[PDB]
Amino acid sequence: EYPTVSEIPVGEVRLYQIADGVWSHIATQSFDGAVYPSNGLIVRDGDELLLIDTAWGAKNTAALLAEIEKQIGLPVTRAVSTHFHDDRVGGVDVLRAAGVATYASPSTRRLAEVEGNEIPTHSLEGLSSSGDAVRFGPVELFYPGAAHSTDNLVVYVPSASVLYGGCAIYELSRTSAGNVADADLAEWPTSIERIQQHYPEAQFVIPGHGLPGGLDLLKHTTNVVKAHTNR
Ligand SMILES: O=C(Cc1ccsc1)N[C@@H](c1ccccc1O)P(=O)(O)O
Ligand SMILES: [Zn+2]
Ligand SMILES: [Zn+2]
Ligand SMILES: [Zn+2]
């Protein structure tokens, strides 16, 4: 049901309806001779859409916008990037050129600039301290603390009980740590516990890569991170 790498030729984007007015977007990138899927989120707000994360690159993000227009037909008016790496901000320039207002926390914007990555236009206030939450249209944005990266945000859709964890939450099939070059391994389990504490009612949990599940993805991610810590 949920699409995988083999259903998505590189350059294409699939959409998957999770609930009324909530979709994930799924795209792929080739890297070091392997192919990786990547998820973002789309949330309806009246007659407009809020986009969470690019589709990992200019080409994929252009295709994302075309697929949204084909299948949903509502304008993407705002986008939020959940951390500074290329799989979340690569494509921001395409969004900006298409008239989408792009957003990230000020920490994300600064780290993106340092990395030479694309930089969302607007700065999201009120997310600088672990445990901070703000409403942004139809979602709540939450800063759980440092995890996969120091700036990583998660997104909750209260109407649908959908929790999008981005790259701070691993799919179940991933049992080894990913790229953790910018991670806070020491704080990551604590940050995951803040997510559990704030969204214990979540029914659908979307990882940054791979298959959705339930809140079981949180403790799974903690297990993987702790195993890596003790490597
Ligand atoms: O977006 C990036 C820029 C990046 C950083 C170091 S190499 C490439 N990497 C993502 C990624 C996904 C699939 C496999 C490897 C990856 O590192 P990420 O670690 O954010 O989830
Ligand atoms: Zn990352
Ligand atoms: Zn603006
Ligand atoms: Zn990622």
Author numbering: 32 to 262
Task: Quote the paper.
Among the resistance mechanisms, that mediated by metallo-β-lactamases is of particular concern as these bacterial enzymes dismantle most β-lactam antibiotics, which are our widest applied and cheapest to produce antibiotic agents. Mimicking the transition state of β-lactam hydrolysis, they target the Zn ions of the metallo-β-lactamase active site. For further analysis of the binding modes, we co-crystallized 5c, 5d, 5g, and 5j with VIM-2, and determined the structures of the complexes by X-ray diffraction with 1.34–1.92 Å resolution. NMR and X-ray diffraction unambiguously demonstrate that VIM-2 binds the stereodynamic inhibitors with a conserved primary interaction of their phosphonic acid to the Zn ions of the active site.
We anticipate an analogous binding pattern for 5g and 5j, however, due to their highly dynamic nature, the electron density in these structures was conservatively better explained by only the (R)-enantiomer (Section 13). Depending on the stereochemistry of the bound inhibitor, hydrogen bonds to Asp118 or Asn210 (Asp120 and Asn233 according to BBL numbering) may contribute to binding. However, the predominant interaction between VIM-2 and the inhibitors’ variable hydrophobic moiety takes place via non-bonded contacts. Between the phenyl ring or the thiophene/benzothiophene moieties of the inhibitors, π-π stacking may be observed with the aromatic ring of Phe62, Tyr67 or Trp87 (Phe61, Tyr67 and Trp87, BBL34). This observation suggests that those aromatic moieties lack strong interactions with the protein and are solvent exposed.
